Amino acid sequence: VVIDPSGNTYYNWLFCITLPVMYNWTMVIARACFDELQSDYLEYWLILDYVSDIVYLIDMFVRTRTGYLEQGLLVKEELKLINKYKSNLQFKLDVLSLIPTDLLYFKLGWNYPEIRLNRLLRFSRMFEFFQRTETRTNYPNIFRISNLVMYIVIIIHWNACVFYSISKAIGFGNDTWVYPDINDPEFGRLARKYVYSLYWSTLTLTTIGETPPPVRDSEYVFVVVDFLIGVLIFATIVGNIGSMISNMNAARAEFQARIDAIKQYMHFRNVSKDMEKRVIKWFDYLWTNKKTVDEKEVLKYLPDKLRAEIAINVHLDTLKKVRIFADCEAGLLVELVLKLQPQVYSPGDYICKKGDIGREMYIIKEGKLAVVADDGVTQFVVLSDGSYFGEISILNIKGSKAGNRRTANIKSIGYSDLFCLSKDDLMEALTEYPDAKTMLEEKGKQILMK
Amino acid sequence: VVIDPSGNTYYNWLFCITLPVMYNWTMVIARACFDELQSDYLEYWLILDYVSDIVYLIDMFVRTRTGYLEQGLLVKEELKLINKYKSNLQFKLDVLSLIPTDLLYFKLGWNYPEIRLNRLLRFSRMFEFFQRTETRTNYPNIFRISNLVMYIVIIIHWNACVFYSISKAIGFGNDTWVYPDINDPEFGRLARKYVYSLYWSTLTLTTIGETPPPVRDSEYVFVVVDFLIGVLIFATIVGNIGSMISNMNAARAEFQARIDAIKQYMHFRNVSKDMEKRVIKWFDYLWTNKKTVDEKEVLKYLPDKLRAEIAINVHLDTLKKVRIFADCEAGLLVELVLKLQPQVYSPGDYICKKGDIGREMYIIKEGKLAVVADDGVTQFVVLSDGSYFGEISILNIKGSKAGNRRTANIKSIGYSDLFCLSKDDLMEALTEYPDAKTMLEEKGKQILMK
Amino acid sequence: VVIDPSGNTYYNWLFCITLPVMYNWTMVIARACFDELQSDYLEYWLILDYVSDIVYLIDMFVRTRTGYLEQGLLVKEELKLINKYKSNLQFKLDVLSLIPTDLLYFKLGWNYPEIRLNRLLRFSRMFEFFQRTETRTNYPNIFRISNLVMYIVIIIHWNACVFYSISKAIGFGNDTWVYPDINDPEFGRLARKYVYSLYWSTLTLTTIGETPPPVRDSEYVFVVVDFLIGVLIFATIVGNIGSMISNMNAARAEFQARIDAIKQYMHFRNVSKDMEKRVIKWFDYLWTNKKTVDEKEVLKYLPDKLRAEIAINVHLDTLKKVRIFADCEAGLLVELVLKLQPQVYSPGDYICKKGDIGREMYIIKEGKLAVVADDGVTQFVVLSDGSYFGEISILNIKGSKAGNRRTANIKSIGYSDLFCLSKDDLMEALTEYPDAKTMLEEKGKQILMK
Amino acid sequence: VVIDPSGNTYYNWLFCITLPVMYNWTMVIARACFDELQSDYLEYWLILDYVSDIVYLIDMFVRTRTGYLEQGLLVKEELKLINKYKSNLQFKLDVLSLIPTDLLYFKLGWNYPEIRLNRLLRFSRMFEFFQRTETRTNYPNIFRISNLVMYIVIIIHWNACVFYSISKAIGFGNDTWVYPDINDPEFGRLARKYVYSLYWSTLTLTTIGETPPPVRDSEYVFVVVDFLIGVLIFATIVGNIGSMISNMNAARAEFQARIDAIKQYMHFRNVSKDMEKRVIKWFDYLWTNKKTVDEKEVLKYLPDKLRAEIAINVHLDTLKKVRIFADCEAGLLVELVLKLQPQVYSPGDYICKKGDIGREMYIIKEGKLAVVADDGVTQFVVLSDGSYFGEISILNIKGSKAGNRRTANIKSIGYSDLFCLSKDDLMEALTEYPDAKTMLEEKGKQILMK
Ligand SMILES: Nc1nc2c(ncn2[C@@H]2O[C@@H]3COP(=O)(O)O[C@H]3[C@H]2O)c(=O)[nH]1
Ligand SMILES: Nc1nc2c(ncn2[C@@H]2O[C@@H]3COP(=O)(O)O[C@H]3[C@H]2O)c(=O)[nH]1
Ligand SMILES: Nc1nc2c(ncn2[C@@H]2O[C@@H]3COP(=O)(O)O[C@H]3[C@H]2O)c(=O)[nH]1
Ligand SMILES: Nc1nc2c(ncn2[C@@H]2O[C@@H]3COP(=O)(O)O[C@H]3[C@H]2O)c(=O)[nH]1
Ligand code: NA
Ligand code: NA
Numbered sequence A, B, C, D: 001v002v003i004d005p006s007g008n009t010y011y012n013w014l015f016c017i018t019l020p021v022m023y024n025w026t027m028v029i030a031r032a033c034f035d036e037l038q039s040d041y042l043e044y045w046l047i048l049d050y051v052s053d054i055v056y057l058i059d060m061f062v063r064t065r066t067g068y069l070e071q072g073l074l075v076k077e078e079l080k081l082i083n084k085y086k087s088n089l090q091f092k093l094d095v096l097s098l099i100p101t102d103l104l105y106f107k108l109g110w111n112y113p114e115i116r117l118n119r120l121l122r123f124s125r126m127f128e129f130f131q132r133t134e135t136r137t138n139y140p141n142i143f144r145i146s147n148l149v150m151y152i153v154i155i156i157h158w159n160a161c162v163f164y165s166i167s168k169a170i171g172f173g174n175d176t177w178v179y180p181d182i183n184d185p186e187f188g189r190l191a192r193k194y195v196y197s198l199y200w201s202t203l204t205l206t207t208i209g210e211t212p213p214p215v216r217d218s219e220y221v222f223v224v225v226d227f228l229i230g231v232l233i234f235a236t237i238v239g240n241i242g243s244m245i246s247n248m249n250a251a252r253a254e255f256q257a258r259i260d261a262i263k264q265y266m267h268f269r270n271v272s273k274d275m276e277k278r279v280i281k282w283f284d285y286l287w288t289n290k291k292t293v294d295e296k297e298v299l300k301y302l303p304d305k306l307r308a309e310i311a312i313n314v315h316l317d318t319l320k321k322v323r324i325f326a327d328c329e330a331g332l333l334v335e336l337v338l339k340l341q342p343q344v345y346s347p348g349d350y351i352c353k354k355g356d357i358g359r360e361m362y363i364i365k366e367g368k369l370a371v372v373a374d375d376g377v378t379q380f381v382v383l384s385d386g387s388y389f390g391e392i393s394i395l396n397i398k399g400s401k402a403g404n405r406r407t408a409n410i411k412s413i414g415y416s417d418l419f420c421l422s423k424d425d426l427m428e429a430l431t432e433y434p435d436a437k438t439m440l441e442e443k444g445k446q447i448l449m450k
């Protein structure tokens, strides 16, 4: 065997089947409308159509060999897959899109390729590929815009073909509206035919209108309907363009809107230009160093038993340098990684101060912190990455003259990325295995006596 | 009896009255402006107008026979309904729209059907039908787009009629702007008249402008006002189109935006392509198997005493296979169905692990789980649908060497849809009837000894 | 005083000063550009300009006599108000807009009314009136759309005047682009002048372009700049139109989106058409009876000491029929009115059932409820409006064989609007005055014995 | 060293390098396409190009001398900065944009300035400056709109240059579509050349289309592609304009939407016009006095150890007049400034009333309050700014006949801005230093006895 739709093989086949479906959606109508296209390159159209039909057949086979999830397990029983396929509307659409209507080439002649129009009924495969690509691609907005542009181009191409067909029905050159006479040297070339039809279609759907006005009632009606199709469908698609660009700007726009609200508040309250500059510097840091997004709000949509792995694969850089995690229990790190709230501190920010509520443990992910003196400048100890502080005031200790108080003040030399671990959480998670707690308050007593 | 507006009969009548109202809103102005329309098909217009008026009268009768809610009860007293009708502005509008202005046909002649313009004053019924359909239809966006297209078409039709009337007032063919001379063979046909007027209207309201420029001051003024009506009203309607397409994409766009934020985080943090593929697979599963929507956020707008029924009608498939619910008390299932949080687990995800906080009971809705050994591969027990686990570590038990600990580790073979029932909730809800609890810890002791 | 800007007198004056400001913003540029406008109606323009200037002077006086809030109190000291006025930029703008530039009529002649262009510098007053109207009017969206239309019209009018002025500078009729020769009988009329200039302006700003193309470099540059002004500013304004219509649809669109999510869930889960019809009926009820909006989310932006008054003025209809409120303490009703959560129940919905957690007291605002038998049909007692139930299981009672249990089952005959009062809240709020509690458990014992 | 990108020097250099990048992005294509531009002002183009290249070199030097943050510290080691530069793609782009392609002037002649097209590869610097300006400027929306207008102008300019180049390739005047013959006196001027090309570009990108239709297939194709570029890219940019105006209106629109929901509720519930006027007055006050924004929601994105400084720099005006803060401990004010919830009370609003739950302490930021008698009018004490009340009922006091009760009723004479400090918070924060608490209940006893 089976294909496992989640796999890469299924996605690759989705591409390989979208190619004929897109080809069919573009060219069947073109060949049906522009007769010279069908006739001049008939030897190539036959090859391409037969290849497309072969790929359609192989796609039907793949649909027979693609497993589905019952009880969460991939069904691998062949006949079960055949039944699941045939019971779905997709099998009906596939049989309809693979009906050998090409036999009508013997009746209607080689000049009627619209018999292959049923081949469009595999559009679903194409759309599936798109909805898969949009999910799996690393450039979701580039692909989304390319998809919208493809839809625009297909719509304009189809409307060009429709215009040319209507000109044919009315008669080429019978009036100033229809496509001019084919017998003209310049206006008889297939290139000119298609490109002028596309020009007309673009002017009509984009509602520019710089085309000869209608002459007949059918022409007036078609032009009204087509200008309305233009207005509505092009507003739809080119406003989807707008929404895609909006969601492209979503993060940056939200960040900038927050900054603007802050600046409005500061200018209204006449906040000192010192503090205004400090705030602007904080936000410039958040942007430049790519910290505007908070991983919590993003990863909250992941499963906890997958977001856990995510956090591990991101923070194993530092949670191996820490003494508590991955050293004593070697598994405890998972119990708290999904609750280590990542904070960022500016240069000179006092994370801790003597005589404060010690309700948070900190793990230094990045940055240089200092166990300073209360004078403000004298740096007693420099804590680099992997260090952990703020854990002594969490625990119950014998001989602690300072209970629930910070034993020292910790300031940040530079921008520090820390993991604030709350006291309640450390309490709750160390209950399972105190084999790490013993050396934890080993460190605790050792630092509390000195 | 009375009609009970909530019923299907009332909605069917809403359709049956919207038909004449829509007919009146489309055709009265057309016949008033295009005199040949009124004259040539007068025998049909008379029949249709009289049928419309009869339906208007029957709608007034229905309004006299439609109950309203006082004290939440449907008023069935006839005279009370007559008073409620006559006291509402709707009765005034109905009498105004049913005034026999057709008598003016004897004074103004058969060429003045705008006397029936008062018939438009039942627009409310039409709009009511729409606002009912949008609520009750299964295709809300299809109907909404059809409604907007109907508004566009009606506006363009009315503007075409207005253009033709203005041409008539100025005189057909008196200058290049107005509709050409009626005496022309081609430009005198009612078909050509209406269709060219519609063409002009479309070019003006869509602001394409490929029409002969005005000549007189009245023409310049009307064209300015009409181009502005075009800009404003068509932006309104065709931007409502945009918002409707947006809300069509709302679920998919939110899902894809979450996926994009996740992928941005993973690529920025250089998350391993293993875990990136796992996350993409999780999201592909959520989409393909239609799990992107969380029933909680959707059904939270339902009444609890209706959302309860909803959850029951959805989850009675599994809550009959469970041993606790619908078996001992047979009513307890409602006390917890509105708090069974549905979770989804990937293949191989450890739902439970030995030596963890047993604070959640799980009911396997769909999927195969395994009571494995801690080695990781040896599957002791396979739990299929209807099974419940994680309930032993909830309860107070005699002789439990493992208190508040998982007696075994449960992993998911495939994608498991479970119902996580919190410990606090099971505690709170079993307090009412311990007739099920006794066999609950029957199972508890039986599994805790073996 | 003083005038007290919050008062109605200040708003009326805002209108009376917006009239000259709007007049000045519309007509000064018109008279400056269309010389015939200035000249032909000079006797009227002089009167209107002098009246506008008098009103400007009276507006300056009002600004001297309008109090401001210092320490939250309206300043009534005259000289303090004069200082507050003169210290503001508004005084500078007012003196600038009232500078007697009309004296230049003696130097530049009566054909130069753009000397009155400084009169536009009172635009602020106009805008203030708008921002006041939008706040105080009952039709905020009608006024907002009228304001946007006024901006569109003013922009188009100004661009028409600019086009005519540029034609004058280049010379009327010197090329096909500029306004045609004034000496023409038809193209020399002030009506034709202004209306064709407005036509050109509309075609340019709405970017229709059906105007003679530029000839000179200045004309090309102006047309480029004006088409870009068109694109940008008209997108701005006519997209503000879109956002205004969106916020017009905001409530209805949110309601309908909730209904659509519900219907999607129900159709996906194959919810029985019984329950689907019940849900659709619930939502039809919510809409038809105007219950889609929840007063909590709306009134949460009001002050509690004003939202309290709001809730009182709305619910004094029923909280006078209740026995506890406004009867014993006569003031207790305010302590709980801001926490009476309004619920709606469908016909037949069991609000209470025997043997359930009695943690909510209910006050029947509207609707008929029944104290039924557990059989389901036998109605023991019918509770109409003003009745209160679910209070016995809240209180501590002697001789209650049923503790924390519902003494009877309450069902809703029809759609009941109730006030669910939580047990914790009744406990917390009755602590202040048990003078009502005594008769509360009077009723309690009386019903618990029978 | 180093430059410290957060500093003002780096931003100034960002401007000084954006000037050549913008110059290059505007003029290289212009000179490449309009040959007369390159030739006539070659002496000036050479100077400007060499100055631009010198500034590019100095920008490369700056990039070598700009520190980056490792461990949150600004790297000042020269060679480390050289490595960080050369290891980034920016160094590749800078070397590519500074390659001396001007040497090709000796081969291709002075008429080929597109060899300087590589100079566009420093676009990043320009964009960086923009993203810095948008952050640091006080007019974020003005700058954003200016940036979008710059993008529009650059796109139109580039498309004008492209049109002129295509006309050159096809041949000037070979058909009606291309730019006319250069040999024409009027259509040969560089001014006319560029300005008509810009006119064509504006008509095409804004999709007005009032230009001669294409003649050749290449012209038709280019016009289709360019009209589509117009539609898509101009919708993008001029809808970004819409979103920028939306976020300009965001605060005012949210405020007005809240007011509209309130007014809809009041008119639907038939709220008395007294209370409707009171609510409208409250909202008029909120707007006029600039209180629609709540500093909590804005400043919650700031760091707590920066939002603290913000609140201090804003509220030190009053927290120096208070007796508790900045007087006894002199540091306690920071422990509670981030939890002082700012409330606003209308004139006559009873903040406190005798016999109520004293769970909030109030600090009068602005406004006159009264310790009144319960009669309602007799004002015992007038509390101005700096005063604090509601603190007696917070504390545990000996001899308090009124426990957890308000000792008096406080009403607001005028609009009072207060700081509501919750009881729990005062309890929690005074635990650290009771040196202020002693005089706190000094005041407490002193007022409780009298
Ligand atoms: N007092 C003290 N604290 C230190 C030293 N080195 C690291 N620290 C950390 O500084 C922290 C300050 O807050 P805590 O008292 O909670 O915990 C303290 C220790 O974790 C040291 O040498 N002396
Ligand atoms: N230990 C054990 N647990 C089982 C077995 N079969 C099912 N389970 C479930 O596995 C669950 C693991 O978590 P709990 O200990 O809370 O509850 C356990 C039982 O509900 C079994 O055979 N042995
Ligand atoms: N048992 C009983 N309850 C009644 C009667 N009339 C009204 N009620 C209300 O029905 C309510 C059901 O819930 P509670 O027991 O909390 O409170 C009960 C009473 O408030 C009655 O006649 N008998
Ligand atoms: N009773 C009384 N209260 C006063 C007086 N002056 C100020 N107050 C304040 O009024 C407040 C009312 O609420 P509290 O009793 O909590 O605290 C009271 C005091 O803080 C006074 O003279 N008498
Ligand atoms: Na156009
Ligand atoms: Na157009």
Ligand code: NA
Binding pocket: A208, A209, A210, B208, B209, B210, C208, C209, C210, D208, D209, D210
């Ligand atoms: Na046009």
